[model samples]
Target chain A: SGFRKMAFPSGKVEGCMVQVTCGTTTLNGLWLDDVVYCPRHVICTSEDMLNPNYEDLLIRKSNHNFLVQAGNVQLRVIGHSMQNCVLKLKVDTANPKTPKYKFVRIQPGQTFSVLACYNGSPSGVYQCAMRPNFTIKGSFLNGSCGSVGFNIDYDCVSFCYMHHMELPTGVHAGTDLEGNFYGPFVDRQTAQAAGTDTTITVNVLAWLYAAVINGDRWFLNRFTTTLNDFNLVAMKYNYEPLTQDHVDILGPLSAQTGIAVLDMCASLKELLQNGMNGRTILGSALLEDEFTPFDVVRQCSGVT
Target chain B: SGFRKMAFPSGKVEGCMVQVTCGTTTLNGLWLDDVVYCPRHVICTSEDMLNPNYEDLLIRKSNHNFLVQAGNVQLRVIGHSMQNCVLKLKVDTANPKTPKYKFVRIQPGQTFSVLACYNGSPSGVYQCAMRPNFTIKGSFLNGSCGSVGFNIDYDCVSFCYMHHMELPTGVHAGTDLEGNFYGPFVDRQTAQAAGTDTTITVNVLAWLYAAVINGDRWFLNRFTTTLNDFNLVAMKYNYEPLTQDHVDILGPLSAQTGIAVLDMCASLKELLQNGMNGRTILGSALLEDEFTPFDVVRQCSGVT
Candidate 1:
């Protein structure tokens, strides 16, 4: 019941799964329509199969992303699909006036994610939470072309958050007492150096925001190669056609300041590079904001 | 089911209370001999009463401390007790080899705790825990002495831990990432400076282990003026006759190296203080061991 309602949020958008807490145990549930279903056993199709401890609540990867309510809206994914398979997205559908879509190629058995960034941490914090898992369906001319019905089964269910590195180029976030917080790495050399340390990432939801440069929509979600820790590189900060949802929520394109991934990246590069030492929030206008707690994670969607 | 029977642990030691989980609720139940009793309503006897929560399990604190068992065996408390009241500790009686006892005064509305410190932090971690409440009763012959009859129904039920201040003379345990691991503090001044921030304390139960420094019975518990934060401390670091229970579990004093509070404190004062940059554990030889992770707590018995 947070960042909900107060902000424009879209709940349970058909076919998405969410992780909810039922009583003293955590359940990987499917919040369908307005109901919940937690399965006790999972039928795995991969060798990476797991038995979620004590049989408390087991579930295979379901398509769900707790952050996709209303505000932020771009989605990217990584998983198995035919080498030639692709996602035929009907993007401007929200805008009945303009109708169009894009086809993003899929790479099987990999990481894929999508987000609608509208945003912006500490420890031993205790709270009950409802986490949503985002879904991705990659298909070729198979998975159902009678070639064994494509044989695609779910694998893992987890939520993703935007990693807001509130630091300058060449900087690294220190390992805090809990081994929880790390790099707001300003430089790739350092972020790459801290790659081996995985799992305890506290993210700031900044990546959810995409920049539309000269009709080129440079959203980072589409830029993530594979979820294999790109603490390494940002492919080519490019763009595509603007999605209608952007203007629906952010208003006219003219009312905005120069915005886009490359805009913010270079802006930040210079910000940190020049001692402006701050982060930019893509509000109605790409606004410049002062640095926040260097050690705190402000936008997290986990059990509180 | 933790240190439950690993070595030797006594479960429900009569009238004691323990916090337990029932479904998704935290019930402050009475873990008598065997069965767990979680009452939804409490008829309080003292003004210092409380509602556990949500009426989920409204229990008026039924004595619990997630620590205590065959290994460590000292318990202390801080609460209300009429003036002149005392705890009649029947120590050596547990031996059956000898019989002895001690009377410790309890100042009302104060901090009181006890432990059999064998000891130990960090966070963003979550788990379900069943904490046992160790009970303590004190009376100036009243709440139950016919003059209201030592009205001790129950106040709070939480666990206790050891505070291993692994720092040297003139040094201070820095506040770590989670603000959880503060001073394994060596100096009183710094410990006091950090006291204003209440509630998040990670202790290393050294006070649970008493010292027979030259038969001075230099246990810190007996010296606590009142639980009001005496990081200011050590009232002469005195001693008392060794309780039979001490020898019963510790075995013949011959095998023990110069041990006890004074032994360890000064030993540690020098250990941390002398550039050894370490902590001393009172094992068989009162054995000297190396320092451990400055920010890591090794021996803790919380819900795993």
Candidate 2:
């Protein structure tokens, strides 16, 4: 493998993140057509510059991962002027050596938006290589490289929404969001009101919290005595400590909140749309601190 | 049916309870219409009474009977007569076959307030003989009857209000008005209140007596294994039994006037008005004994 040298107008693409790799050449510049363009003045792509279009796309850190929306769409891939230019994109990288030779038209200083029907591409990794659309009349510029990744139901509505649907079974709709779980929902409605209109993992957690803390002795005894034995699964979730005094205080709230959450759960069923297993997302929401119940629900339900 | 002869006073006739039957052999003076009248110093009608007109009306005793209004539409059939001249009312007889055809016009001394609203005459039996237009020439007297019966329902709206709607599925609103079921209600509100609002029968029974006893089991369970069943039914009727440890001391209370009558059942339902299926009444109260869950609810639902 030979290293390919490439260069960009320092002023035009200064803050953009980028990624370029050479075939065993172990060099980074403008990687295109099985060639590493390591032209003079070209610097190696920094690991921090993994998303070359970050600045162009205004991408920022978020709880959600990236996705290429399904259906007809125009995705922008911008570039700047260079002495030389080459670009490439791979929908399937199984044959990394034999690249799909489809050239896209573009110009310097122009952010080109390409039209592609992602109808069939629910979620498959795709690659993009950049070069000149027409042979460079005089000079060439290095193209940009980056990728967006997500699952078939990219928004995770398939799993996120389903997780919400099952929430009521665990927690009641009427729970006091602040008194029990005390998560972000304090300003929102009660656990139940939110659960009914829209729900989250915390709603269920609140139920579990109330159930255990309020001395539902039977519930606590069984989980600790029976289910806790063989079920590594059950061992994962947190159970609050139980105290008679705590129950003496929270019992009424728990009961009322439980009823509310249940009611909310009932209403949430009607809001469910797509039916894809959200168990993964559900587990993620439960085990990981990533998605709030509402966020998961919104993503799955196409709340955008 | 044979006519029995009963004698009172020519003078006392103007006051004492009376009975009259006729085959036509006349007796006391005035026989204005239907049959023959035999006159002697035995003047058939009392000299003091010439209100010659008597309206023969039929009345029977049911757990619920009827009455006519006196002054300003309030009538009381006081048993004793006032010194002033006036009298009216009829009672006593085992034969349903023979109707008691007795008519007594009332004046000042007799202030009778009998309650009967044959309004639409939804129930059968009725008779006025004629329109209301008549008067007396002699000085009018007055009379009174027994006091209205009393059981519980004293704070009728209180526990009865609480117990009534609760009885339908458990102990009824009309439970025999006497029995062994007993308990206490702690707070002035419900079990679901104080983190105990919307609570149980034993919860209330516990209230009736036990708030002074053992602590609430969560009033005994997590709602699954045991309390969910018996306590639910107990809850349905509002009988929260204080635990034995708690009840041991209260047992003496059970032995005292408490046993004289739970009387709690009486006030359970306000003779729930409106003749619906009783389902509605079931929701109004949730309490009591002496009557099965169905009975109390039925009575409260106006089963009678």
Candidate 3:
């Protein structure tokens, strides 16, 4: 009964794929409906596949952006942007008299995310356009731009917090301890040179927050990767990754925010469950290679 | 299922009481044959009932040492001795062909415990005589000496290990993390002045072993004191301190060595059961007043 509600996976978006143009490049899989889906961390390239620099084409020509829901508005992000630009995110069909939109500025090698909501429901289709830094003149296809859709139905923070409270004090301690243990892993060389030593206790929830806010990409990437591996294993066993059994064990978690670009909702749920018992949640999720405790703790602390 | 077997309370040692004399001080609560009972942490005293210093006489003149079983032999100690003396603990009456015995020299303000077994069974009463530093001719009742009985039926180490293993990894981390968080509470002045700084990872089992071997008396005292308090509360609730639930939970531990002097089999069982799924175990069993996490960790490590 103490368990929180979780956003159940809708499997995948159906029959809603569309095409969008960015400069002279055009890309498919930019689904412009109320629902959308794409492979995690994958960019549908716009350039010719025959090009020797295929990755360069994806990186330089394609807009590495996606959208999801945050409350009633849309949150958009251009992850791993290749060029600097100011992008406008808004509902294209909404009246000019009652505009509902947001903007984010992205630089090379940076990811920009913004939250925009309207009437508190993530049930809208949104358009992404590019504009000059100080100009109101906006074009829908000059830079990295496309339509992003949302059907967001969960709140990540509330869900995470609820999951956290159910954990035993021991589990909390383990998570914090292990997190610090893996902190240096965020940057191996710098972390290794400094050596592994810790002072002061880490609050697991606070650390989780900092990881998200600071965009600790290494750990986040590790978290997603671990979850992906788990997903494959669970699937191989013909088991549903997120199920009633988990809800029963951990109590329900909040389901207000939608899934992440990495499709790590199931993995996050498992982390919450494992964390409650103070088991090696992160290691199982993140590790494929054998790592000493130092390797684990260093990365977790964002040691790099 | 991996839980250990516990020494369930024998529902109080039945019948059979004996008298023991320590020089001018005489005690009559010593139970001989099968089962016995004595006042908790109480002394029978040396003075007449009319004497104003009856309790003071017992406190000042008597050593509160007694005996229980250690497999086939006896383990005895005078918790608080009146004078520094070497005590020879041996079977008072047994086959001379196979004599089983032990000796301990106690210093002022210190407690001494010794295990005395013969061919491996604690079935005989023992005489603890004062032998002047390795003397060949020993007197049975001189130099702060007393007789102690034994019928030990449980092993402290096995029981403690079972308890330790049952604790979730998080609990282990919490214990260690907070152990340093609260730091050394060996004494109020030094402990308080140090102000609790820790920079090491303590293995829970290692800490437990070290505490026992190091004779960390302060922690041991805290443990016993906490158990006594829990015992009173348990009795008040009309609950048997040791329950079938615990027996089921801890499986069967070593029945060879018998229980500890304080007989914390029941308390340890409760701690294990409560520790499952990260439940609150220590606060209910150990906390009576405000204590730092260190206080909790030290005793959980084994104060007594």
Candidate 4:
């Protein structure tokens, strides 16, 4: 539409790896209204940025999409800013394939948080995003988009004081400043006459990484399926049809997510909100890509 | 569990293809409740003598399970008397195999009709259910069971003036007996005309037989998988841990049927309801059956 050229200040630190923390609402110097309202416009920019995929950054890449080894991260966007954002977090491993980005969306003034979780000595390049649409018209998303970093991943509930509704699949790269993180840190009492340093160690299982990968995939796959299905069905058939009726007992869903059915079938939502699950099979199938067909359907049906 | 003995007059119908037509609500002397709710002892010896499996006699076979024509067949469970009768017409074609019964529970005092949409025609042998629990005990069905020889399958709307809710899949067959069959006869104009005699022609597609068989199999397979998963995760984990207040707020179906999460995965519901639909692909690997896994589901889902 229009042009709003602004250079967002970004400073980088170099060590084994440097982590910076920021929020979607924090870029005060940049034109918030310009970027938030007219998303394609460049309200902020950063030069000499890290160029890496989400998986690589979360695992091995130097310049990752999101810096995920911080406490927590939070971000907020205005309605005009963007419809949704997709961030990919790549991991560095022995058989690392293509780095993956965790797709995310932040509606107007909607705040989302991420919790950082990595096993062993974590090392990777991570990047975050605030995509307004499918493509980045300016350099903002390509090289200098705004996102955050997080290290500690724990219960965001105690810190935020809100029942976390969102269930993300990938590792939590932490959220913008508004988000909080409870790291595994402890100060112990003196064992003897003199006080001794009580080193903190995050008790983690060896199989946890695999579990996290699996669990995240299971959960996220469900989310994506439901969203996509809802969209597709809406496109394929009218979810809401026009009828010559002034009165009716039942009406269609006002804002039915095509994924509504997928969610039920997947049962991933049950897994997230409820720790213990009996309906993992649905979600597991969707994640594993196992389903039944129509002809077979008739066979089992007691139709005669 | 306890029994009450009562004596009634013996009324018998002696004919080869005898249809004890209870005029509107009388004439048919078959007692439904005495048979369906009868104690096993009395049913095996006494009831069998009165209303025997005629198909066994016609086919000259000892085994009573008759393989009748497939597609749509009406099931009538005459209980106690006409007032307690239950009737349902259903599609008996299971698909790719012999047809089985899918019984729709009829009203206490009325007949029940459904869209007897069997994929095949009258030639195909179809199985049917005449009671709520048909799979386990076919003999312990209600009163009398028969079929109206309609070449063309049709849908029936069942309702009572007392209740406004349209029954999901069952309609009383005799509530408007004349209107159902004879109404069509009265609509023909020009009685006693030159060309009064007309031979009505009906077409019954045979492909439906295969469709019903295969479709039934797919329905059962997916249904089994979904059930397994639901019990494994959601039932045991998520739903079980919900607070009492949460359950109350959400309402009845939140736990058992899979609530918000279940709705997200609504494909399973449709698959269970509509045999095999063509959308949402689970993995073929998971469903290592002879037929394709989730044919309809796979086609619908763009996620994979």
lDDT of 3 by residue, A117-147 (tens): 1111111111111111111111111111221
Candidate 2 chain A TM-score vs. reference chain A: 0.19
Please write out the lDDT profile of model 4 over residues A41-107, one tens digit for every residue: 1111232112323232223323322223321322222112122122222223211111112222232
lDDT of 1: 0.20
lDDT of 2 at B159: 10
Give each model's clash number: 78, 127, 62, 141
TM-score top scorer: 1
Can you write out model 3's per-residue Cα lDDT over B163-261, one digit (the tens) per residue? 000011111100010111111212011112322111111112122222233232222222332445554655553323433433332222212123242
Q: At residue B51, give the lDDT of candidate 2.
A: 29
Docking class of 4: incorrect
DockQ of 1: 0.01
Best prediction by lDDT? 3
lDDT value, residue B271 of candidate 1: 23
lDDT of each residue in B1-304, candidate 4, tens digit only: 0000100000100000111222121111111211211111111223343443423322332112211222123224322211212221122222232112222333111111111111111101111111211110011012222311111011121221111011112211221211221111111111311211111000000111112222222322322233344434333321222233322432322332333323322333343335333322221112111111121111112111
- Model 1 stretches astray by more than 4 angstroms: A1-202, A206-304, B1-304
Against the hidden reference, what TM-scores do the models get?
A: 0.19, 0.14, 0.16, 0.14
Q: Which stretches of candidate 3 lie over 4 Å from their true place?
A: A1-242, A249-304, B1-304
- Measured with DockQ on alpha carbons, how good is candidate 4? 0.01
Clashes of 4: 141
Cα lDDT, model 2, residue B81: 16
The CAPRI classification for model 3 reads as incorrect
Per-candidate Cα lDDT values, in order, are: 0.20, 0.19, 0.23, 0.19
